[PDB]
Write an enzyme that holds these catalytic residues in place. Structure first.
Site, PDB file in Angstrom:
ATOM      1  N   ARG A 151      -4.728  -8.083  17.053  1.00 49.21           N
ATOM      2  CA  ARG A 151      -4.631  -7.995  15.589  1.00 49.21           C
ATOM      3  C   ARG A 151      -5.021  -9.261  14.855  1.00 49.21           C
ATOM      4  NH1 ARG A 151       0.628  -4.226  16.017  1.00 49.21           N
ATOM      5  NH2 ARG A 151      -0.383  -2.452  14.935  1.00 49.21           N
TER       6      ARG A 151
ATOM      7  N   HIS B 103      -7.784   4.644  14.145  1.00 42.04           N
ATOM      8  CA  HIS B 103      -7.010   4.383  12.959  1.00 42.04           C
ATOM      9  C   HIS B 103      -7.691   3.366  12.074  1.00 42.04           C
ATOM     10  CE1 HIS B 103      -3.439   3.364  10.589  1.00 42.04           C
ATOM     11  NE2 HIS B 103      -2.773   4.323  11.214  1.00 42.04           N
TER      12      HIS B 103
ATOM     13  N   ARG C 249      12.984 -12.340  -1.933  1.00 36.85           N
ATOM     14  CA  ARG C 249      12.720 -12.006  -0.540  1.00 36.85           C
ATOM     15  C   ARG C 249      13.924 -11.548   0.229  1.00 36.85           C
ATOM     16  NH1 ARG C 249       8.233 -13.551   1.254  1.00 36.85           N
ATOM     17  NH2 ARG C 249       6.729 -14.618  -0.128  1.00 36.85           N
TER      18      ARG C 249
ATOM     19  N   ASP D 163       9.626  -6.939  -5.291  1.00 32.11           N
ATOM     20  CA  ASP D 163       8.443  -7.319  -4.522  1.00 32.11           C
ATOM     21  C   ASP D 163       8.249  -8.813  -4.644  1.00 32.11           C
ATOM     22  OD1 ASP D 163       5.788  -6.339  -3.067  1.00 32.11           O
ATOM     23  OD2 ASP D 163       5.086  -7.582  -4.843  1.00 32.11           O
TER      24      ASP D 163
ATOM     25  N   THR E 127      -5.198  -1.875   8.683  1.00 32.76           N
ATOM     26  CA  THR E 127      -4.125  -2.026   7.719  1.00 32.76           C
ATOM     27  C   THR E 127      -3.860  -3.532   7.442  1.00 32.76           C
ATOM     28  OG1 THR E 127      -2.299  -2.159   9.358  1.00 32.76           O
ATOM     29  CG2 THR E 127      -2.940   0.115   8.617  1.00 32.76           C
TER      30      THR E 127
ATOM     31  N   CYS F  67       2.846   6.799  10.192  1.00 30.24           N
ATOM     32  CA  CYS F  67       1.835   7.772   9.772  1.00 30.24           C
ATOM     33  C   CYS F  67       1.381   8.569  11.003  1.00 30.24           C
ATOM     34  CB  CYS F  67       0.636   7.044   9.201  1.00 30.24           C
ATOM     35  SG  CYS F  67       0.185   5.586  10.214  1.00 30.24           S
ATOM     36  N   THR F  68       1.210   7.877  12.114  1.00 29.90           N
ATOM     37  CA  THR F  68       0.662   8.521  13.334  1.00 29.90           C
ATOM     38  C   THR F  68       1.649   9.552  13.845  1.00 29.90           C
ATOM     39  OG1 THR F  68      -0.661   6.554  13.836  1.00 29.90           O
ATOM     40  CG2 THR F  68      -0.230   8.092  15.593  1.00 29.90           C
TER      41      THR F  68
ATOM     42  N   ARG G 121       0.853  -1.175   0.000  1.00 27.99           N
ATOM     43  CA  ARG G 121       0.000   0.000   0.000  1.00 27.99           C
ATOM     44  C   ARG G 121       0.903   1.244   0.000  1.00 27.99           C
ATOM     45  NH1 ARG G 121      -3.733   0.091  -2.457  1.00 27.99           N
ATOM     46  NH2 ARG G 121      -4.527   1.911  -1.319  1.00 27.99           N
ATOM     47  N   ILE G 122       1.907   1.257   0.851  1.00 33.75           N
ATOM     48  CA  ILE G 122       2.829   2.424   0.908  1.00 33.75           C
ATOM     49  C   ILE G 122       3.703   2.437  -0.355  1.00 33.75           C
ATOM     50  CG2 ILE G 122       4.703   3.586   2.164  1.00 33.75           C
ATOM     51  CD1 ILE G 122       1.878   3.855   3.390  1.00 33.75           C
TER      52      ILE G 122
END
Ligand SMILES: NC(=O)c1ccc[n+]([C@@H]2O[C@H](COP(=O)([O-])OP(=O)(O)OC[C@H]3O[C@@H](n4cnc5c(N)ncnc54)[C@H](O)[C@@H]3O)[C@@H](O)[C@H]2O)c1
Ligand SMILES: NC(=O)c1ccc[n+]([C@@H]2O[C@H](COP(=O)([O-])OP(=O)(O)OC[C@H]3O[C@@H](n4cnc5c(N)ncnc54)[C@H](O)[C@@H]3O)[C@@H](O)[C@H]2O)c1
Ligand SMILES: NC(=O)c1ccc[n+]([C@@H]2O[C@H](COP(=O)([O-])OP(=O)(O)OC[C@H]3O[C@@H](n4cnc5c(N)ncnc54)[C@H](O)[C@@H]3O)[C@@H](O)[C@H]2O)c1
Ligand SMILES: NC(=O)c1ccc[n+]([C@@H]2O[C@H](COP(=O)([O-])OP(=O)(O)OC[C@H]3O[C@@H](n4cnc5c(N)ncnc54)[C@H](O)[C@@H]3O)[C@@H](O)[C@H]2O)c1
Lengths: 338, 337, 337, 338
Positions: free
Chosen positions: C200, C182, C82, C37, C185, C155-156, C12-13
């Site tokens: 999580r 938040h 990887r 990737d 994610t 981000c926070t 995503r980033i």
């Protein structure tokens, strides 16, 4: 010169219609000059600009004061009265009312705009009783200029009808079953609460909610040869916009999937251009947000069995794509105005 | 000797209250004998039984005809009139009305049930103007039997007040800020549509929606020493039920997290038993569905800085836990009638 | 003279960063020349173009073959390994690696890109151990050109730090507590499944999920005077993007809400222009999608008690706004190379 | 005495299967004695007890230490190895392995449990290559006790097959199209991320996501007369559990909706009792959470056109109802053990 339009009901379809018009305003025979809705102009200007689905309106500045909404210096007059007989349609010289409240779909209800002084009404929903029904790209050239009240049918009907029309002409549809997997709408409840329909009473964002739809029977009004040959249902699911129809037809001429696809693709390039879009891409519902077509055929989901049982699947943006059609029907009435 | 109760507004709180009562029915001094709501008994019996949040009602059979809901053979009379002055409360011998419509929270509004013949009203929401406000386990023993209209505050206030009361007694709260991260409610819109509050107007299941709350000021009504010392906000988020308060207090006596936790744990075992629950488990909102406590303290989230700035976090089932408290308040009024 | 950049981890980033760069490409000292990737170029070109959050990429055509992604005729080489020690960074002349996998945040992990031949690494996440940490508009001008591994924080932290810096300079922050509400994610699970963090592990789109955050401690690394003075938590909620921080500070100079608002508004117009945006509008999360600021102060939520307890609330697009900051940090490193 | 069972993969189906067994434990010929999974026993005991879908496990206490999960004093041994050849199946005397990882669905993959010492494997998914496939109430009495690897098919197949079997026998199914509107599963991504299927790559809770399904072809393995006659698709939608199939059949014997309903209702009371449930209620997906039937026919959505085009709609709890079937298939293998 310009046909003066009022919007009655500044809801999802009312405000999507207004945003469609603001983006097609340079070509148009319409001028939106009034809005009636149950709330005030400051609330309504806020919602017109700040949309959870469409995003922040960019093209032009939108403001309001006690009695107008302003959208790029165009001043739209606002009033607030639930009873359409009281509306100031004569005083504002309103020719055409876009009836988007959802509660004035019969001729008796929609007529009250005519009493208030409007000349015509376009209902953004199926009509109740005999109101002529038009679907752009299927039967809108049959419009009769002497009609004072019309219907632009439902979002599902606008997705299904053009596809049925292409298939019927190429293969001969004898019978057909539809299911639409459809985004929730404002007609459903946020949490379990009273409703005429016991399924729509239930928390819309937590449930798959079956419900009836008139779309499949309504196709028989716009394609009169198929009257009585189609039936279907809806499943409401926890997405806020974008819907999909799955249609299974018993056809007369035996065929295979590749030929069904080829016929639709050919129609999408010619007779149904701008109405049906043919997609070969592997996409999901969020990708069709904002799509201008009534129906996007998802070509790789097409299948046929035994020659005569044909299944197609098509996407539609039930708010935006429907509102583009309402605007097209309106522009068509404007160009054939009597 | 049974107190005859009518429910006005058979919504999420009205129907949660009814289910709470149906499960505690053997111990109760209340008898629910009537419902007024804007829709009909068949619809309402269907919604009482089939609940997206609580599931299918199991204990007893629920049926309806044109004028009653039947829940385990107990017949609950139904009427449907928006204006409470017209309600048949004298004719049904109603003692106590549970006011759960959300639209009759001032004294003038709630008094119309008294005009119609009820003897008392318990509003399931903060009162507007001065209506005595009670939070069970904080100040309900100050209830005065001569009061004819009372408020059981909000869900958020029932979660926050008991924790504030424990912390104030142990450390001395000088000021405090609250944020509740709260499930959406029926007051919000499903898709962007007109609303008094421009934020609540917005699609509830797609957005984080800030909104004001009086819960933090209302704590000052039930703990009068703290009047004017607390403030807060709400964030509505896309869950249908279960909420969480985050409370940050400036306290007088210096402390650390372990001690703040110990004080609340001790109160949860003694004075606040049944009102505060103390949890050391690493759980998420869906695990608190159906919880009977007003506040569930999530102990490992407790933190303290500089001795005097204290943060605690507590869960509450805003529909069920609150409705248990409305029932408790009602049983308390019944016992002191 | 262009700094040649490779993206490690096209998540995503990674993909938000790529889109940010494609839109600011005419002004830039960076050239993205490579991606590593775990999946292939066709899949990655499809995901770059079709984004559930950002929509369909409009500016330029995006295609792929077996070994490149093409974005407006610019060819981006792709590899899939990887283990970063194996990457072809010397062979591609890579100057700067954008480390966005989430799994190489220690110096030892990130150093493997240096072994492979890259000259510098910018980690898109807090560093583990002492990696210099920068927040653009707070301390990025302390960047030292000889540093080979840096962190752009979380981000926070990018949302909280600029606001803390403004408030500390105007009022003197003695202690502070943060909660971020938040968006979920990729680190969370779709349905309950195994995870290091038991919270999580739980179905992200059905639950409010508390979780720890280092963002409040990390503010002390970028504003060294506040080291050890701040703490906080996170609540993950069922929105896919856009987050909000709620910050409560104990300050030295007594104040009121209007003054706290004025100080941040003034900074948003001058020293923090482009970093803090000041909003007086009553908006909800979905309205902040695509916002370029690190923090958007929601002014009408500001409150103060007793002169010294101050609460502010600020929005951030955790994917896009953060990625704009990674790009800014990278352009800054480029300009001082 | 007892058939000793191990669960390989303690996922949604692994843990639902374990909860089904814990509630039917007094009647059973099975004893669950081991679990292998990629995480540790403390994590797994936590997830077994605290379920976002099923709620908190009530009947018995559940704890864990470094090497066991304890559920009501029954100690279940735990190990953690991704490669099934290394598992301690001989040492634990494992007879039957419930293969619920999703990655060992071919005979070569599932056989490695046999190498490790197990005697049989029941795959909780369609088999790849020729693994015998059973659907309880359709073909499970054909089970052959000498088979060492079997499949219990998919959730969708368990919902569809019994209904197809009832209709085929009463009307003669010539061809059939299915769509399942299905809850998202752990196979999809939470936010857009790489996946073999470009549609399943997309944020599962924000989208309607079409995808292929083998369920309709797999019906032809359990009802061999229909092999090649059925096809279908899936739409994944933003609910976490409970799914619905919509099935449209071309049948030979002409009929109407009332008779289709009557035939299914009669089967639900007799030959398919406990497998098909017939519902006349107006309910939504959340109401079917925890339902024990493979298929719940929603009778008022049934429709027929022209005699021969029949549409039925049925619900299923894809986690729980499927897991009850896995447990039934297992108990059946236990009672016919060789
Ligand atoms: N997907 C869709 O949303 C969709 C698609 C096609 C057709 N439609 C149809 O369009 C119509 C409107 O649907 P919608 O989704 O905008 O609903 P909505 O509830 O968002 O909009 C209705 C609007 O009219 C207002 N209103 C209600 N009664 C009124 C009255 N008496 N006078 C003035 N204003 C009044 C409401 O406040 C609201 O602003 C309905 O007939 C619906 O069936 C909806
Ligand atoms: N989390 C919560 O849901 C929660 C928690 C605590 C308190 N409350 C409070 O409880 C009250 C109701 O909340 P809800 O969530 O049940 O709302 P809701 O909309 O589900 O319930 C309101 C019910 O009353 C009906 N109604 C409306 N006007 C009426 C009238 N004039 N006469 C009779 N019936 C009428 C509605 O049709 C509905 O059945 C409000 O005061 C609310 O603030 C709600
Ligand atoms: N809101 C946010 O999403 C957000 C905000 C700020 C910072 N971050 C941070 O950015 C980083 C990535 O976050 P994301 O949300 O993009 O996660 P994500 O899972 O979407 O992205 C990770 C990407 O890297 C790939 N990957 C994993 N291991 C790899 C390896 N060994 N080699 C190459 N590629 C590999 C994944 O397949 C995926 O494409 C993390 O450090 C995260 O904490 C995220
Ligand atoms: N609706 C449903 O969830 C449903 C219904 C019917 C069939 N199925 C099938 O059941 C199977 C499992 O599905 P699920 O939903 O439980 O998925 P899941 O991801 O929740 O469960 C898979 C479990 O196996 C573990 N695992 C993965 N590889 C492993 C290995 N090599 N060794 C040991 N453990 C390993 C995972 O960590 C996880 O605990 C799949 O084959 C799926 O197709 C699912």
């Amino acid at each position: 010169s310009m046909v003066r339009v009022a919007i009655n009901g500044f809801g999802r379809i009312g405000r999507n219609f207004m945003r469609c018009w603001l983006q097609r305003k340079a070509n148009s025979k319409l001028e939106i000059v009034g809005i009636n809705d149950t709330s005030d102009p400051r609330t309504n200007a806020h919602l017109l600009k700040y949309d959870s689905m469409l995003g922040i309106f960019q093209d032009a500045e939108i403001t309001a004061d006690d009695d107008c909404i302003y959208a790029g210096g165009h001043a739209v007059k606002c009033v607030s009265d639930r009873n359409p007989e009281n509306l100031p349609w004569s005083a504002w010289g309103i020719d055409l009312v876009i009836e988007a409240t959802g509660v004035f779909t019969s001729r008796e209800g929609a007529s009250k705009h005519l009493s208030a002084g409007a000349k015509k009404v376009l209902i953004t929903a199926p009509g109740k009783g005999n109101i002529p029904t038009y679907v752009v790209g299927v039967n809108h050239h049959t419009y009769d200029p002497s009609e004072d009240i019309v219907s632009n049918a439902s979002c599902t009907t606008n997705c299904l009808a053009p596809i049925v029309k292409v298939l019927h002409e190429a293969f001969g549809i004898q019978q057909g079953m539809m299911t639409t997997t459809h985004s929730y709408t404002g007609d459903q409840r946020l949490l379990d609460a009273s409703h005429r329909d016991l399924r729509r009473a239930r928390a819309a964002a937590m449930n798959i909610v079956p419900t009836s739809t008139g779309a499949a029977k309504a196709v028989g009004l716009v394609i009169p040869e198929l009257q009585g040959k189609l039936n279907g249902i809806a499943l409401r699911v926890p997405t806020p916009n974008v819907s999909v129809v799955d249609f299974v037809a018993q056809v007369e001429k035996p065929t295979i999937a590749e030929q069904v696809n080829q016929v639709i693709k050919e129609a999408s390039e010619t007779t149904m251009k701008g109405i049906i879009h043919y997609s070969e891409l592997e996409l999901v519902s969020s990708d069709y947000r904002g799509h201008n077509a009534s129906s996007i055929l998802d070509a790789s989901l097409t299948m046929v069995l035994g020659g005569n049982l044909v299944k197609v699947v098509a996407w539609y943006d039930n708010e935006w794509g429907y509102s583009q059609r309402v605007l097209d029907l309106a522009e068509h009435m404007a160009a054939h105005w009597a």
